[PDB]
Every structure is written in structure tokens, then in C-alpha cells.
Symmetry: C4
Subunit: 389 residues, 4 copies
Amino acid sequence: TYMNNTEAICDVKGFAPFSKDNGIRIGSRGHIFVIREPFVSCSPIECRTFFLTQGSLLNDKHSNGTVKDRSPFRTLMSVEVGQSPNVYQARFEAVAWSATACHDGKKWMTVGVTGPDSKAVAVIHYGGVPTDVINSWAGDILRTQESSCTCIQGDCYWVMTDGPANRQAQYRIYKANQGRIIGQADISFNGGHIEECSCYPNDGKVECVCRDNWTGTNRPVLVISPDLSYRVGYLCAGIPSDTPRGEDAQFTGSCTSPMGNQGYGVKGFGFRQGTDVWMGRTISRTSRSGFEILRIKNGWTQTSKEQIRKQVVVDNLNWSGYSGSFTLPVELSGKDCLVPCFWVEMIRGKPEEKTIWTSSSSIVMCGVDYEVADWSWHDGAILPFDIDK
Amino acid sequence: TYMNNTEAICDVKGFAPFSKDNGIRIGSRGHIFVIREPFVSCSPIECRTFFLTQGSLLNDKHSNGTVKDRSPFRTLMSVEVGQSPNVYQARFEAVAWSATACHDGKKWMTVGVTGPDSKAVAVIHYGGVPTDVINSWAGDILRTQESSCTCIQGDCYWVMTDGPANRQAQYRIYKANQGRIIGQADISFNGGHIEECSCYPNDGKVECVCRDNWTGTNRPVLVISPDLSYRVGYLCAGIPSDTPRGEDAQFTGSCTSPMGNQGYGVKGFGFRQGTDVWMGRTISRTSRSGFEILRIKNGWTQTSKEQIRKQVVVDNLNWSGYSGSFTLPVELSGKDCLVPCFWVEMIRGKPEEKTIWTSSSSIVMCGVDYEVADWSWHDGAILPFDIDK
Amino acid sequence: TYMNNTEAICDVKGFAPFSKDNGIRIGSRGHIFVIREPFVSCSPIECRTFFLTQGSLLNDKHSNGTVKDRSPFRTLMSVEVGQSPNVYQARFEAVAWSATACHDGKKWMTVGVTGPDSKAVAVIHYGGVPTDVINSWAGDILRTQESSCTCIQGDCYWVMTDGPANRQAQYRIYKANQGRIIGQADISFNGGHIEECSCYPNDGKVECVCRDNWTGTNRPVLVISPDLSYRVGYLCAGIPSDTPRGEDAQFTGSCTSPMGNQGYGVKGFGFRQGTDVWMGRTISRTSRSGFEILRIKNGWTQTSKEQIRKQVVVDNLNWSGYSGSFTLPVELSGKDCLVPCFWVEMIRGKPEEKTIWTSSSSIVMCGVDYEVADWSWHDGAILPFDIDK
Amino acid sequence: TYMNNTEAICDVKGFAPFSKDNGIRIGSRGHIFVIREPFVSCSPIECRTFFLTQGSLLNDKHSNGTVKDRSPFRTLMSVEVGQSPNVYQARFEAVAWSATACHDGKKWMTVGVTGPDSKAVAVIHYGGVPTDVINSWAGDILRTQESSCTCIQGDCYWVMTDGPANRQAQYRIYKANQGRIIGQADISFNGGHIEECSCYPNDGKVECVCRDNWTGTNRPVLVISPDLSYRVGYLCAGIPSDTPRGEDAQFTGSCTSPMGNQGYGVKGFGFRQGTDVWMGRTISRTSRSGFEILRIKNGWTQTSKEQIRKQVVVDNLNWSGYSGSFTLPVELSGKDCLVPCFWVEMIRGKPEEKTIWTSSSSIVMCGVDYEVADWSWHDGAILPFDIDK
Ligand SMILES: CCC(CC)O[C@@H]1CC(C(=O)O)=C[C@@]2(SC(N)=NC2=O)[C@H]1NC(C)=O
Ligand SMILES: CCC(CC)O[C@@H]1CC(C(=O)O)=C[C@@]2(SC(N)=NC2=O)[C@H]1NC(C)=O
Ligand SMILES: CCC(CC)O[C@@H]1CC(C(=O)O)=C[C@@]2(SC(N)=NC2=O)[C@H]1NC(C)=O
Ligand SMILES: CCC(CC)O[C@@H]1CC(C(=O)O)=C[C@@]2(SC(N)=NC2=O)[C@H]1NC(C)=O
Ligand SMILES: [Ca+2]
Ligand SMILES: [Ca+2]
Ligand SMILES: [Ca+2]
Ligand SMILES: [Ca+2]
């Protein structure tokens, strides 16, 4: 049976802790993959953490991080949410140095990108076997989102970028059924930049909050309809949520253009709430440290600066990183709306700390009907480690 | 299908060994979580051991026990009963430094408390996803039982405390269906103290034997009806079963008030048997060492001192700790009563032994129709360990 | 659905390798329980290896074998046949320093004996929970077989001994349905000795070949009918198959009495084949080294010395140990007879080798319609190990 | 339900990455079997990697590779495709120093060969238990293919060799249903040599591309019909694909005879594509390094040298090894043809590198409708390892 996912996103007043994997603390002694991107996606039976491994373990010499990001060894794997990315519980998914994954209600579909920068291949898997491919259309690091893709009534959707990471690139919507491409669309976005989209289903559409790695410190926003027509622009709110970024006071919002005139970025997310938005961001404006989520009244549709809620989940003394969106399937939450959820990656090691390696662990939060107090569910590993000596 | 759990508790003459996990002995070399509270709860398919981890492994530097009890890293996880709390067999349950869990016959419901002492959040999970929350109502370490909660005909019940741990606090009964709160009640108990309840279903009610951490060396007793009306008081028996406590000879029982005038305590349990009671306690009156279970004739309803049975399961040369109640589901035992069962936590390390760490393992016993001989199923680990050097 | 197991044992001309777990070789680096008695029993879905652990791992200090045989820590656990007794694949079964286990077609029934020598308790488990008990009836090390018990048409049968291990003891047949004792019988056997029976179903009866630890170098034989009437005696064959034992030439067989006048023994097995018997034994007459299986024509019913087949599975340069019987369920083999099968335990360490520890691994063989060549599937571990230094 | 496997092989323009296990990189720290032959075979539910272990782990002294190839310890085991051959995820299959395995749609059938060189035994397993045997018919190392066997409409087929490995030997087709031999055939092939066949189903027949270890640098080709009649010869293409071999320019193809006049070989594969063939081979003509797959137009039926496609998957700077064929079941791919797939073993250690041990890892590729760019998914382990010092 296909998941509908046609419902509204739940209006939430805050976010409750779902899981914490403690991967790096455990990896001090246990057998844990070195990873990045521990994103979460759910079937109607369970939620899983997906991740990119380098084929190496924490506290081992192969965790030497001199080896390139897009290596022959990178592979998408997964465990149940809350479990560490340990070897002995891991399900293999795809060969990938960039990835996305989602469930249509019957099976898991994953997409793994590997191969050379100049001509990469994305391999779509469905139910445990490859079913289709997408080759690089523009010859420059074909790449996906690094979070959950989005299945609505049996058809699944995701966004891909091919081209420069610090200039104008090319962006495409892909649609598949049962692991087979049934439609695609070019995203016209001159002046704009789209990387690493965080999507969720809402009102029968796919909504995505992405990363501008060119000039924007506000986040691009894509709203995809089932027929592949779309709306694209920026998160209207007059508060920047990318990193690096300037102060809130020095920012004017925009629904259409990138603002802030800064390079770089970090993958992030946001949730529409009628006309409001929940927006994640690191606490530091310059570093990937701390994590907070703000509700901006009318921030989805207006250049609003009306901040009505603020919740801290990782304090500014602690390293964060990537963040992404997913929803709880109706079959699991028991609700008649789509509970909005996010994961926060917590990066340990290089370049901020004195080790030969880099990994991350995660905390996952789910939208609830109540205000939830500030705290810090930080990584907690004690660095440096044994191999670092 | 919901479990009825409307049956009488079985009248038992003694207790047979169910399981022993040997976690710490195994953790000398294997990959085992450092834990506390290895409580047991059963679905109609199996019984699982739940536990609190600190995100660290035995024989690893992160097992340094200087890190606070209620830390960002603590997480409720579980394995099948008898298995060590090893990483590679563990199911993730909830972020929690205090917890309870039980099965309604369809799915597992768990409750995990985390967040700051002044404003803690309890996150209810049902079928693997968070479904509801309870925030601290009195601002002082919201906390649950650390043993199995209790599901009767599809509705599940548990007790929570918020407030001082050595003075008058506030106590509440919570009721949920399918992970959603459908009722609650304040427990009026002036002069009394309720911590860490050990509950079981009996005659269509929930009966709880708890821990008075204020002045009582006898144990408080709560009897909860489905409509949330209740009876609360103390275990009538003229024999104290908390720790620390005085000698039996210097004790007068009470059905209504705390007796003994001593602070502190340890989580424990008892089982109604008509008007008799089975009561667990450590053998030492001052230390958490040894474990014995006594049957007191008319000890549930009278200030009785008539001890008619005594069974030792952990000798006084060996460390014990927490103890808690659960029942065998009718679907598993094949009986028409609810087989009463308990677990005994066996704490190793600080503060009694010369190590940097603290963990525990467990032995689980189930009520049988026969007298069972004294023995000692103690932890057995050889301390100190490698990191302790 | 209950297994019938009412069929004839298959007539076989030899034995084919089923599995080898390589536990000790793997345990040089992996996380493997120290064990003894790796017996095999099958459900209609799979065959599992059961074993006794001491709660310790190979290459760890807790594997120090100074700790008593019948310790508080011993526990019955299991894995699928061919898998090493590693921690992370192990299913917990029972607290036990002596054990038996079998499947009735619906669930697993196990029996674990633990507690003090003077008053031991045997706890019967059914479907993962304890369901019944047997206390020591004669006060001297209550104990079972250490191999598969036997289920026929839903009722399961096993043999137990209580009393001296080197003199006249007491022996009993037990019968259970769904983990509940429904019948028992005393075995009258003056002059005889029964230990560690290896049973299988055949023609609607349970046949057992056991170990005389008193004076017999031939093996006692018990044939149990469903109503608990029985036939008891010795394996008629004029060839001794216990260890230690004398030469074949110096032996006269007996159907009724122990022959050989020697103490000690080793658990072993045999299979009726019409009037023939397959009999296992170590190759050495004095040591537990080597393993061979002989077919003696008319050896079940006559003092025959007519040896018609001989197959070696472990050469005399290599350590063996215990051996036991089980059958392939009809639902798995696809046959209309009960394929006879055995396991050979291979003991490494003390007292024969220079280590602080003792464990064993196994090879499992199944009866086939063809003559199978001699070879040696010995343990293969390289001793001593790391902790031994 | 039996798998049909009566469909045509899909015509493919190239091959997409399916999985990479990274076993040796992981085995630097994790608990990974030392293996060879990581072949892949699929049920309608999943694809598994099968492998031969020596009962030892990477980075352990038992991985000393002085121990013979056909040892008492070798055992066929399996994991899901993409997973490392780690202990704690491994399913035991058979005792074997040579093996094959395939799924008929209901259960797994495996065949494991063990025992002495002069009189080996092959034990057929079906659904987890041995069901039949084949003894050596010619007394000289009975042996199978080391890749997936082939099930068509419930009957499974495989090729076996018995006799010299560098001269004329004897070759046989075996056919089984439900693990029971129902037919066999001798392969008449004077002057020819057949080893280690790589088979797949195509048009209702089994097609096999094998290894001539006698004089052929081209590969023998066997086409088996359900009634055991067959066609046997050499891959017609005028391009040699065994290793060692000469240059392409110095080669004339043959449909009937071995060409090249060289000894030795390596297991390989090829796929019929109408009259074309996809042929795998190492890049080096003399070493097992690099891996490429070529499409030769009319190369199945003619001495063609018309190379129309070439795809590199392992570069010539990196070690390869064995390679083998399997297909995606229709139930998994969703197609109406049989997606052709292969695995490439990547051997690390002796004799090419300075270590005491030898293992391999793998990359698996599946046929797709698009041209896929050259890359190198090599093993990646950093040698030597810890025990090598
Ligand atoms: C701008 C996003 C992307 C463009 C190539 O680059 C990712 C940046 C980045 C980071 O931590 O900021 C980490 C990434 S996320 C990923 N898959 N691996 C990375 O190292 C970069 N992505 C790729 C495919 O190289
Ligand atoms: C009186 C029970 C409770 C009150 C805060 O304190 C627990 C005492 C205690 C002990 O071993 O005695 C261990 C506990 S049980 C638990 N969850 N962790 C602990 O360290 C204390 N509970 C909390 C939430 O901090
Ligand atoms: C004669 C069988 C039994 C009588 C107490 O003693 C077993 C002998 C023995 C051996 O290797 O010979 C090993 C055993 S088998 C087992 N369960 N553990 C052992 O150490 C002995 N059994 C007991 C319950 O102590
Ligand atoms: C020619 C194939 C076979 C003939 C005995 O010998 C295999 C050669 C070989 C190699 O890497 O080239 C490795 C093999 S494949 C295998 N099962 N083990 C090996 O060591 C050889 N096979 C046997 C049964 O010994
Ligand atoms: Ca940016
Ligand atoms: Ca107290
Ligand atoms: Ca004897
Ligand atoms: Ca050759």
C-alpha cells in the first residue's frame, strides 16, 4: 500500500527529543563507521538513519581524513533511528558520496551518486536492487540533497544539482515510481543557487528549503507540484538562517532573491506553518556550532522579523553541522497531519579539533503541541582519540 | 489485539531463575553499554530488558563516571531478556535519564525523560515514534519509575514525581492509549513520599510498591483504578523493606504512614498475594548488598510480622541494587493468572569499589508453584578492569 | 502445528558434513563465549546450536577456568547451526549449568538446571518464558542430558539423573506438553548408571544412548514409550564405545549389564538401524581425541562384533569430546524418515593444553545414503592464546 | 512459488555500481572473515554475497596464509550484498573449500565441497539442511564454480569438475530439485578444459562462461538445456579474456577450440547479448589487476574483433581477481528481462603484497540502459596491517 502523504504539516509549538545515537562516544571502543550526513527517513513501519561511510571505523588508521570526500569507498548505509552507525547493525544501501532516500509505503527507494566528478552516475535503488540511472547532465559533480526525499501517493520526488558549487549551477527536479524515472524538470533560477535540499510533503506538494552556496545567507525555497510545475525563490523571512551569515539587524528579507552577499553555506531546513515558518540555524553566525529553531510569524510569505518562538537543542559551546527535514508517516504517529521532524548532525574532528579524522553523530527532534525547554543534546565525545596519538 | 491483563496475580510459593545477562563479565572484553536500571517488561511475544546507557562502553574512557546522572547522553535502549546490553543487539527507545516502558498487546509504549532539571520533558513513544509529551509541572526533576509500566485492556498507566527527593514532593498518575495521554490524576500524600514505583496489574487494577526517600523505611503502596481514583498508603507489614533501614525487631508496621524515620532509599517491589505480600529487600540493612524475598502472611492488609517464607537469590557478600516488578502475559505463560516476576539489578563499581566507572547486570526471577532453594546468582565480574589502571 | 516425529530413523550408509562453527579460531580475535556442550536441536524451520557459557569471552581474564563448573554464571544460550557462539548473534535461553532443549513444532522448550548441588532447580522454558519447575528429588546435583530432547506429536521427553556420579544414582523420565510437566517415571536400574542421554525419536518411541560413569565402558540404552513404560539396558554390541575403555578384543558385549569394569566416561550417542547400530566413539581408548562412527551389524539386538562400516570425522591427532544425537525434522529434509544426525564437540585447553581456559567448537554431520570418505574436521585453533601469556 | 527465470537477458549499454563491501578496510579494526570468492546470488527478496572463510579474522594470527587452500576449516557463509563478511551478520551455509549457491524462488540451495583431495564430498543444502550428496567421481579435487548456480522453473543446475587442473579433466552438469539430484550429464570436451563456471539463465537455458586452466586464453562456453543436452565450445570472439593471456592483435578467435597456448587462468564471466557478448577481463594481460568489460559485436557467434563498448570499473593500478555472473530476479527489478549482473573480487595480500595473509573485497555492478563512465571502485585497504608487524 502506498503512503498518501497528502496531509497538512502539523502546526507545532516546539520540538521533543526523538533519538540520539551517541555514535562517536560509542566509537571510542566499539566498531562504528566514520560518517557524515546522518539523515532520517521513515517508512510506515519505522524511521531509519541513513549515512555516508568511508569504509572505515573510528579509532582506526583508515579513518585518516586525508582521503577525498568523493572517494571510491564512500557508501550509503542505514540503521534504525537512534542506533549508532555500527557495522553489525548496518543495512547496505548504495555506492554513494552523495545521496537521498525515502519510502513510498511499499518499499525503500534510494539514490546514490558515485563515479568521476566530470561524469558522475546516480543509481536509483528500489527494494534493495538498482532499478534506474541518471548520469551527470552538466559534467560537474552531479549531487543530491543528503536528506530524506519525498513520496506522495506512490510517486517520489527529489532535487539534484550539477555544476559549480560557488557560482551559477544547474538544478533539476526528478520524479520516480517504483525506482523508475517517470518525469523530470529543469529549475530556472538565474542569480540563484540550490544545494542539498531539505524537503517534506505538505498539502499534496513537496516543499524544500535548501542551501545557497553562492551569495545567499537566506535559504532558497522550492515548492513542487505533482506535475513538475514548481515555484522557486527564497524563504521570505527577514532573518537569515544559513552559515556563515550576518547579524539579524543588518538583514532585509526577500521572497525572490539571495540576500547577504556571502559565500559558503551549510545544509539546513525549515517548516511552513500556514504562513509562519520554523527555521533551523546554527547559533554562531560564522561557525557550525550550536543549534536553534525559530518560529517567524508570516515568515513563509512575508519579509517578517516577528520572532514568536525560539528553542535551543544544541548550545553554542558545542559543534553542530548539517540539518534536515522529514515527516512522521500518518500510519505511525496516528495523526491526521504530517508531524514535522528534523535531525541535527554534530561534527567532531577536523578542521576544528586536533585529530586525524572527522565524523558526526546526531539528535532527532519531532514537532509537538507544546513548548519545549532549551537544552543541549550535544555529541559528547572526548577528543582527541587513541589513533590521534 | 490488546492484552486484557485483568486477571489475578498468581499465588506463588517461590521464585525460579528466568535469566542472567552477565553484562559486566562479558563487558570485560565485549562491547557493552555502561548502564543502570535493567528493568524487564513483556509483550505477548517476548520479554525485554530495558536500560539506561550513558552512550559509553565498559573498559572505555567515556565510562568515566564523573559525568552527571542526568546527562545529555543518557538514552533508553533494550535487548531481549537474558542478553547483555551490548551495542549490536540493542534497540533504541528514547532519550532518557529516567524512564518507563510497557506493551499494550499491539505495540510498545515507552516514556523517556530528558532536558533540564528545572523544566524537564517526558516524551512518550508508541510503536517506535514519539506520540505525546509531558512537561515538568513543578520544575524539579520530573521523573518516572525505572521499571515496567502497566497496560490493562489497551490503556497504560504510570506514576511520576516532580519536586524534592528528600522532602515533600508532588506525585501523579498518568494514563495513555496508543501513546496519547487520555487522563491524569494528582496523588494527595501529605507527609508521604513517592519515588520509582514498581507496578503490576492485579484484579483489574494497577498495584504499585514504591520508594519513600524522605522518612520511610517501609514502602508506599498505590492502588490505581481505571478511572484514576486510587488508594495510597504504606505496605501494612510490620517488616521494613527499604534500604537503609533499622532492624525488624525495632519496627512497628503501618498501613497509612511512613515509619522508621530514616532518609534515603532504594527502588524496590512487592507482590500482593490475597492478603499476604511478597516483599523484596537487600540483605544488608545499610548497604545495597544481598537480595532476599519474604512472604509476610496478611502483610498487605495488616501490621503483620508473620514471616512464612524466605528465599535468597543474591548473598550478602555480593552487591545488589534496584529491584522491580513485572508480570508474564497470559499469552506467554499459558496460565489464567498473572505470573508475578522481578528483576534484581547488581551494581558494580563506584562508590563501593576501586574503579572509575559504575554499571550493573541483572538476574530475573519468576513466580512458581514450588519452594525454591537459596542460592546466589551474583554479578561475578572481576574488578578492577583495564581502564581502571 | 505439532511435529509428528513418528517416523522411522533413516537407514544411512554414512555421514555428510552439515556445519562447523570454528568458534575458537574466530575467538582468537572476535567476541566469542567460552563454552562446553555445543549440542544441536531442530525446529521445522531451522537447526540451532545450544551451549553453556560461563558469562565470559575467549582471550579475556574471566575465561580463567579456575571457576567451578556449576557456577552462578553459567547460562544456556543458542545460535543457528554453524555460527560461532558469539555474543552478538546469541539468543538467551535459560540459567543453567546443565541443560536440554527441543522443539515441539510450535515453540522451543528448554530446561535449565541451576542452584546449589544439594537442592538444584530445573526450570522449564517454553516459548521464551519459564513455565514449570523440577526440584532435585535426591539432593545430589540434579542434571539433564546436554543434548537435544525429543518431541513426539506435541509431547516432549527427557531423562534426568540425581545422585552420585561414580556410584548408584537415581534416574527419571520426564514428559511435558507446552512447557508443563504432564508425567514422569522412575527408571529402575540397579547396578546400572545413566548420565547425559543422547536421544532421538524412532518408530513412535524415544531411544536413548547414554553414559555409564560407574563401571560401564559400554553404553546404557533406554527406549521410552509415550505412556512412560520403558525398556532399559545396555547397547548389545560386543564393541565398547565409551571413553576410557579397553580394547575391542578384550570385550564381550551385553544387552543387560555394564561391561568393562572401568570408571569415568564421556557423553556419546548411537543410532538404531533396524537391528544394526551406528555407534560413535573417540579413537583413543583413554583420551578424548579423534572421533569415529562404526556400524555394527545386529549390534542393537545382539552381542555382535560384525563391523561393516567405519567413518572417521576427527583424526586421533586432534581433541574431541562430547557427542550427541538429534534428527532432521521431516518438514526440512523433505523425507519420510527421520534423518539421523550428530554433533562432535572439540575441546581445547585445560587439562590437555597449556592455557588458563577451556572451550570447545563443533562439527555436525548428517546421515546420508552414501559412503563418505575419512577426513578430519578438527577445531584448528592455534594454542596458547594471548591471555595465556 | 518457483522463479520462472525463462526470460531473455536484458540488452544493456553499460553497468551501474550496485554495492561495495569495503571488507578489508573495515577489517583493519572490525571483526571480518578472511575470505575469497565473494560471489553474489539473488532470491526474489534479496541478493546475498556468499564467500569462503578460513575460520579466521583479519588482523589475527589465524589469518596466517600458510594454511592450505582446501583446509578442514573452510566454510561457506553469506551476508546481504554490500555488507562486509563480518562475523556478526553472517549466515552459515556449508562446510566448503569450493562452492556454489542459488535460489529457486522458495528456498536457497547451496552446494559445499569438502573432504580429502582423493575422495571429496559435495553436500547439497536446501532450506538450511543438507539434503543430498555427490562424491568425487574421478578422485582428483571434486570442485564447483565459485559463483551463483542457476534455477529455472524450480530446477537448479550447476557445473562440476573432477581431475587435473592443468591437463584434461572431467566435467559434469548436475540438476537438482528441492536439494535432491534428479539428473546429471557428462560433458564431452577432449582438448578442452572447464573450471569455475559463471552461469546465468537466458531464453530458458543456462549459459556458462568458464575458465580453461590448461591451454586456453579464451573462455569455454557451455549452453545447457533443461533435458541436460548441451552445447559446449569456446567464446567465439577474436579477443582473449582470461589471465594470463597475449595481446589482442596476436589472437585469432575460435568457437570450438582453445587458443593462445598458455597455462593458468582466472575465473571470469561473459554475457550473451543476442549475438554480441559482454566480456569481463583484468586490464593487465599477466596480472590480476584492473578490471574492464568489453562489448564485442557478434562476439558470441563469430570470431569478431569489433569492439563497440569499453567500461573500466577497477583501474590497472589496483588488484582485481575472480569475477562472476548472476541475474536480478524479475520479482525485484520489475523488468520483463533478466538484468545481467557481475561481481569483481579484489584480492589483497599474498602473493603480491608484503603480508602474512590474503583476502578480498568486492564491487557489484548491474546492467543498465545507459553508457556508464570509467572509474575505479578499488579495494582501498592500506597495507600492510597490524599482524604483519
Ligand atoms: C555545497 C554542497 C556540496 C557541493 C559540491 O558540497 C558539500 C559540502 C560539504 C560541507 O560539509 O559543507 C560536504 C559534502 S556533503 C557530502 N556528500 N560530502 C561532502 O563532503 C559536500 N558534498 C560533496 C558531494 O562533495
Ligand atoms: C530518589 C530517586 C531519584 C530522585 C531524583 O534519584 C535516583 C536515585 C538513584 C539511586 O541509585 O539511588 C539513581 C537514579 S535512577 C536514575 N534514573 N538515575 C539515577 O542516578 C536517580 N534518579 C535520577 C532521575 O537522577
Ligand atoms: C557424569 C556427567 C556429569 C555428572 C555430574 O558430570 C559432567 C562431566 C563433565 C565432563 O566433561 O566429563 C562435564 C560436565 S557437563 C556439564 N554440564 N558441565 C560439566 O562440567 C559435568 N556435568 C556437571 C553437571 O557438572
Ligand atoms: C583452476 C581452479 C581450481 C582448480 C583446482 O583451483 C582454484 C585456483 C585458485 C585461484 O585463485 O586461481 C583458487 C582456488 S578457488 C577456491 N575454492 N580456492 C582456491 O584456492 C582454487 N580452487 C581450489 C578448489 O583449490
Ligand atoms: Ca550560503
Ligand atoms: Ca527510604
Ligand atoms: Ca564409562
Ligand atoms: Ca587460461
